[PDB]
Amino acid sequence: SWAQSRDEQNLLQQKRIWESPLLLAAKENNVQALYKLLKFEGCEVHQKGAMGETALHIAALYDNNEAAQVLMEAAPELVFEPMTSELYEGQTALHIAVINQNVNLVRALLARGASVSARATGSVFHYRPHNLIYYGEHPLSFAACVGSEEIVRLLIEHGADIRAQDSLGNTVLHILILQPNKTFACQMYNLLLSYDGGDHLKSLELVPNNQGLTPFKLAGVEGNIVMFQHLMQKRKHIQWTYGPLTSTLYDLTEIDSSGDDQSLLELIVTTKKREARQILDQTPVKELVSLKWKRYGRPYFCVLGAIYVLYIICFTMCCVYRPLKPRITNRTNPRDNTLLQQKLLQEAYVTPKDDLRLVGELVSIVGAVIILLVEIGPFHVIIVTYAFMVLVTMVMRLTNSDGEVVPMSFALVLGWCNVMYFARGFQMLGPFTIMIQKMIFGDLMRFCWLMAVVILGFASAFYIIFQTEDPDELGHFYDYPMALFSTFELFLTIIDGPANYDVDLPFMYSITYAAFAIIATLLMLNLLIAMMGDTHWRVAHERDELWRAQVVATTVMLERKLPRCLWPRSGICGREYGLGDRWFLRVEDRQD
Amino acid sequence: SWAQSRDEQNLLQQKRIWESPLLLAAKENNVQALYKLLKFEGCEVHQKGAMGETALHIAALYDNNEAAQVLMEAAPELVFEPMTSELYEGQTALHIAVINQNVNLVRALLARGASVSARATGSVFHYRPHNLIYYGEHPLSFAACVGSEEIVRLLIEHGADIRAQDSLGNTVLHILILQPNKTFACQMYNLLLSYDGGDHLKSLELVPNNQGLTPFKLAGVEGNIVMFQHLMQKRKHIQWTYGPLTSTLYDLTEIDSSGDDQSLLELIVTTKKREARQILDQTPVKELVSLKWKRYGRPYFCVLGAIYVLYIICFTMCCVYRPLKPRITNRTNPRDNTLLQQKLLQEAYVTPKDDLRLVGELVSIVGAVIILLVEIGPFHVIIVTYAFMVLVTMVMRLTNSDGEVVPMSFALVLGWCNVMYFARGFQMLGPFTIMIQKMIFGDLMRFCWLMAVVILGFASAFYIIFQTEDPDELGHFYDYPMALFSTFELFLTIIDGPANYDVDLPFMYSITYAAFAIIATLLMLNLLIAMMGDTHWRVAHERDELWRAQVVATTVMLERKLPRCLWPRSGICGREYGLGDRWFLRVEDRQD
Ligand SMILES: NCCOB(c1ccccc1)c1ccc(Br)cc1
Ligand SMILES: NCCOB(c1ccccc1)c1ccc(Br)cc1
């Protein structure tokens, strides 16, 4: 494994440190042992340890400014030495001094002429979930993350480039967005803006990420609220202060679906970051999406909903009024227990009341392909397999198979179970369907593994008990599978329970079913209690916040496929008004 | 829309401000730019901006006492200039100085001779839910709302009229009732009472609203407790202090149903304000309604309840003993599955045991019209459609239609479901029926939309599965609608479940019903969890408070329609005792 290789090399280093006396005296900061190894007896002052480190590299891991100076005064070429290992390919002696906030060592490494543009492209400096931190590649980025504002400026003094981007195309600003101490990263974010060129164009706040992300837009996708609140102060204008009233005018540029994507909205609903869902609830955005929904958002969702309501009640009207036949097969020639009345009409006659079905069968197929023409959570897979069964039934039609009902049946449940997708929004039943959305595709697929276990023990028992018994009277368990289906129903107490009192029940049924009734309830009562984990107070706020999440998500969906002769752009643009042509939304509020 | 017009005009103003250099220097407070535009080069000092504003109006929005003075020293006619726009029709320069608490500018606008009676009848000053604040029309009202007691008195010094009413007939006192800072509005409420005429008649606390509402009575309907507690100190008298005992004597005038309405009680239960329900729980009122119910309130509600109990068990006794006939229609001439035994007797014979039914049918119709004679929450619509079905059944009688049972049946459930209305009060089952009152008319009408969706997908499936099958044995789904009714019951597991083991179940029933059983439970279990939102601790207090709400509501109902030879007036009047003829209720309490 990889998690053990670094554990071993961290120990193989200590071996070579313990083995190499130069690296040892540099670790133990033994001043009276380096000169015994560098001046009297000239040892290998360029000693590469296990991790390709030098004596100065070891003298920097542990703040040994003495051992560092001894190695820089007896061999001033060790400062320019980078780590020559795989785990630290790029790290130098200045990196460790800036990380350790060794100001007097950064001040001394810079007085020695260290490089302020050395990238630390080692594998331990990467952005991985198994790595604990991530500060970047450039030493200025490290000073920016540790908070040592004295070192941040001290690196700029010696020619540090803020425009310098790492391998991920991240400036020093983007790195400050992925840090915990947001309340102190703001003061460091502003300190890094004061060294800009001072021009309104090619600004550092406008240098986008390699994934097309400005430092302002990244704070929204990552869930960073404090930096999103701090970055908003740079892009908002206040109009007037009328006592408690303050009508502020927000910029609303990258926070708008203007670019095809190139929108903060289209990035909050699409990310899997749970913290990001709190960003559309911020005061510059919440006034947008609340006005994007109170008008022209809610009625259009009711238009597509009502259309799909009628498109589904039409498909059902074509199934209750479909071809008929009093069964052309002779009789019950196979098995006598045959309730078969095949209803297949290959012909296109019946024109009186079938010409109404002719156009009806034509609408459901042109709508099914229209459903697929606009496609080339869980409610997304229900609508696509619905129209898939429509074309397969059209294939079972014109071929008229005896299984002409199995493909036609799946389209009934999927047509309506996808019309409860419109409960998302509309009224307050939205969080109810987002609650079952976590249930159908969360616990159910895991809870059934425990119920099938209980059924496959009792169903296989009730079959052997009534295998000796005659299935004519009390034949709940007769087939191999139907013995399980009756046990499945009996696990839900839908059936009366195999209660035949005229016959003599076998001695093992009156014993096994009692054991099934208790355990079936103890798995039902323990399932009801298992749902109480989402009841304290935040979970009512989480799903209501997640309902508003999928509410704003659907709101942005309709803005892209609908035309533009309706549904205007958010706010008011900057033309015919002394503005910068960018949008703006006038939101006045009141304090206390 | 209207919410965008103000957004545009707020930007069209900034254009004309940016365009007009006079309005611009007045905004930027550029003293060295107004004299360049008023004295050297005489610009249009009366420059009407986009919002009909003057340079002084702009010099007042932002506290620019310099720019204001420059415009009032070079053109002293701008003080009398009101806003000539539609959004601010009436606002002047003094309005903005009082709102901004610009004491030295109010002191200067008043030294310039500004008007202290200018109404600000603009559309943005109206009492609307989309407007953020509401302070009134008169400048004294604005000083009263902002709290600047130095400006409140400074306006009275220059002839401010407290008796001045706005368009809504509201004095300065009524405006202080609709403010958040109640704990500081009290000190401002008292400051505005000290400038009254000093006479006990035509007092400002007695100037009613245009809707017949004194400032004391408004605090109760609005839910304002702190001003209701503060206004009570002016109308209560203490009798004696016996150590911890303090027998206080409350006024009880407008807090009584003396006037036809002209009562604080009749206004708390009728308003939709949830905060107002906390007012009948106040210590001057709670002692009233608790004594209005412990005697003569509870027994009379038991009288009308017992009367309606017997009036309903009588209507049911007339249906179980109604006309009879062994069915005059030939046989089962239509369809053989006909269980019909029509019971229609158009004749008025049968006098032995029917003369008991004759008067019985006469009581239910004279009571049904009596129910309507006293009419010319949800429990209000149950009693009226009940008596409506009584008259329609009387119309189906004397005409003897074959649907003589459909109108007679609706009156059975409505007669009893309206006798559980008497659970409101009586004992502690009141909050149980006010809980189902929010359920029958709250979530049910919304939750059924999601269950019909699930049923209309599976019911329409189980019909096509058993359309090929013979409905003789396992005919749960045979008709177009009955296939849905059986699925509806199966959604509630009332039915055994289509469990026929003698026949061979179709391959698609043994698959679709399993999918129905799980999803039917996952919509049932997710409905049970959805009821937990009313369980933390305040919701048990909210419905118990709402139960007491509908308890006090019913208490005031009986006081109006009942006669006066019983049920005396609250408290003891002020005659034969040295009192003011107004109630009073002697309520002694104990401190600690
Ligand atoms: N192009 C398919 C339309 O998208 B939809 C959609 C619309 C109607 C029926 C089913 C799916 C969608 C929207 C938000 C989420 Br989350 C998931 C699906
Ligand atoms: N005039 C009808 C009598 O009023 B009632 C009423 C009395 C008996 C049966 C049904 C209604 C009423 C009282 C309070 C509320 Br809240 C709603 C209805």
Helical (H) or strand (E) element with A246: strand A245-250
Q: Is A169 within 8 Å of A213 (Cβ atoms)?
A: no
For B142, phi and psi rounded to 5 degrees? -65, -45
Give, to the nearest 10 degrees, the angle between helix A406-417 and helix A379-396: 150
- The span from the CA of A367 to the CA of A7, in Å, is 60
* Same-domain pairing of B221 and B316: no
Q: Any alpha helices (H) in A477-562, and if so which ranges?
A: 482-490, 509-529, 537-561
Nearest alpha carbon to residue B256 among B534, B571, B554, B40:
B571
- The span from the CA of B319 to the CA of B520, in Å, is 38
What's the resolution in A?
A: 4.3
* Same-domain pairing of B133 and B176: yes
Angstrom distances, CA of residue A126 to CA of A58, A120, A135, A139, A462: 22, 9, 9, 15, 60
Q: Is B8 within 8 Å of B1 (Cβ atoms)?
A: no
Q: Domain limits at A273?
A: 1-282
- Sequence-distant (6+) residues with CB within 8 A of B246 are B238, B240, B588, B589, B590, B591
- Sequence-distant (6+) residues with CB within 8 A of B374 are B561
Q: What is the number of residues in chain B?
A: 592
DSSP B577: T
AA letter at A339: L
* Same-domain pairing of B288 and B267: no
Q: Is A491 within 8 Å of A522 (Cβ atoms)?
A: no
Give the Å distance between the CA of A277 and the centre of ligand 1: 19
Task: Kindly state the tokens that stand for B31.
Answer: 């003293």
Q: Testing the interface with A: which of B142, B183, B526 to mutate, by most A Cβ within 10 A?
A: B526
Q: Is B504 within 8 Å of A335 (Cβ atoms)?
A: yes
* Same-domain pairing of B64 and B118: yes
For A585, phi and psi rounded to 5 degrees? -115, 115
- Residue A585, strand partner residues: A250
**Cα atoms in the Cβ-side hemisphere of radius 13 Å centred on B579:** 18
- Residue B194 in 3-state DSSP? coil
- Residue A102 near chain B (CB below 8 Å): no
Give the Å distance between the CA of B547 and the centre of ligand 2: 15
**End position of a domain, from candidates B282, B299, B328:** B282
3-state SS of B418-461 is CCHHHHCCCCCCHHHHHHHHHHHHHHHHHHHHHHHHHHHHHHHH
Quick check: is A292 in a domain?
yes
- The span from the CA of A266 to the CA of B215, in Å, is 52
* Same-domain pairing of B92 and B129: yes
- Residue B444 near chain A (CB below 8 Å): no
- The span from the CA of A555 to the CA of A561, in Å, is 11
Q: Is A118 within 8 Å of A139 (Cβ atoms)?
A: yes
Is A16 buried (19+), middle (13-18) or exposed (0-12) by CB count in 10 A?
A: middle
Residues of A in contact with B136 (CB under 8 A): none
Task: Kindly state the tokens that stand for A564.
Answer: 């533009």
> Which is it for the CA torsion B504, B508, B514, B520, positive or negative?
negative
Q: Is A255 within 8 Å of A219 (Cβ atoms)?
A: no
The side-by-side arrangement of strands in the sheet containing B585-590 is B236-242, B245-250, B585-590
Quick check: is A579 in a domain?
no
Ligand 2, closest atom to CA B557? 13
For B245, phi and psi rounded to 5 degrees? -80, 140
- The span from the CA of A469 to the CA of A475, in Å, is 9
Distance of CA A178 to the CA centre of its chain: 17
Helical (H) or strand (E) element with B313: helix B298-320
- The span from the CA of A223 to the CA of A226, in Å, is 9
- The span from the CA of B185 to the CA of A32, in Å, is 78
Residues annotated in a binding site of A for Ca(2+): 496
- The span from the CA of A199 to the CA of A150, in Å, is 25
Q: Testing the interface with B: which of A406, A440, A472, A494 to mutate, by most B Cβ within 10 A?
A: A494
* Same-domain pairing of B489 and B433: yes
* Same-domain pairing of A220 and A311: no
Ligand 1, closest atom to CA A550? 16
- The span from the CA of A58 to the CA of A23, in Å, is 7
Of chain B residues 351-410, which have a CB less than 8 A from chain A?
none
Task: Kindly state the tokens that stand for B256.
Answer: 């009584």
- The span from the CA of A384 to the CA of A378, in Å, is 11
Q: Testing the interface with B: which of A339, A429, A445 to mutate, by most B Cβ within 10 A?
A: A339
- Residue A535 near chain B (CB below 8 Å): yes
Residues of B in contact with A527 (CB under 8 A): 525
- The span from the CA of A507 to the CA of A518, in Å, is 18
- The span from the CA of A439 to the CA of A433, in Å, is 10
Helical (H) or strand (E) element with A481: none
**End position of a domain, from candidates A282, A306, A333:** A282
Quick check: is A478 in a domain?
yes
- The span from the CA of B89 to the CA of B82, in Å, is 7
* Same-domain pairing of B407 and B482: yes
Q: Is B397 within 8 Å of B341 (Cβ atoms)?
A: no
- With tokens 């193989």, the residue in question is A12
Quick check: is A575 in a domain?
no
AA letter at B118: A
- With tokens 């009502």, the residue in question is A306
Q: Is A385 within 8 Å of A411 (Cβ atoms)?
A: no
Residue from B380, B414, B416 to probe ligand 2 pocket by mutation (most atoms less than 8 Å from CB): B380
Q: What is the number of residues in chain A?
A: 592
- The span from the CA of B415 to the CA of B327, in Å, is 29
* Same-domain pairing of A256 and A125: yes
* Same-domain pairing of A320 and A303: yes
* Same-domain pairing of A255 and A314: no
Q: Is A192 within 8 Å of A162 (Cβ atoms)?
A: yes
- The span from the CA of B532 to the CA of B541, in Å, is 15
- The span from the CA of B317 to the CA of B357, in Å, is 9
Quick check: is A499 in a domain?
yes
Number of domains present in the structure of chain B: 2
Q: Is B423 within 8 Å of B429 (Cβ atoms)?
A: yes
> Which is it for the CA torsion A181, A186, A191, A197, positive or negative?
positive
Q: Is A85 within 8 Å of A122 (Cβ atoms)?
A: yes
Quick check: is A578 in a domain?
no
- The span from the CA of A420 to the CA of A436, in Å, is 11
- The span from the CA of A319 to the CA of B463, in Å, is 9
Angstrom distances, CA of residue A349 to CA of A327, A361, B65: 18, 14, 91
**End position of a domain, from candidates B228, B252, B282:** B282
* Same-domain pairing of B348 and B212: no
Quick check: is B537 in a domain?
yes
Quick check: is B44 in a domain?
yes
Strand bridging mode A236-242 / B245-250: unpaired
Taking CA atoms only, the protein residue closest to ligand 2 atom 15 is B377
Ligand 2, closest atom to CA B561? 1
3-state SS of A190-242 is HHCCCCCCCCCCCCHHHCCCCCCCCHHHHHHHCCCHHHHHHHHCCCEEEEEEE
Task: Kindly state the tokens that stand for A336.
Answer: 């006598």
For B437, phi and psi rounded to 5 degrees? -65, -35
Taking CA atoms only, the protein residue closest to ligand 2 atom 2 is B375
DSSP class per residue in A251-308: --STTSS-SSS--SHHHHTTS--GGGGGTTTSHHHHHHHHHHHHTTTHHHHHHHHHHH
Q: Is B453 within 8 Å of A420 (Cβ atoms)?
A: yes
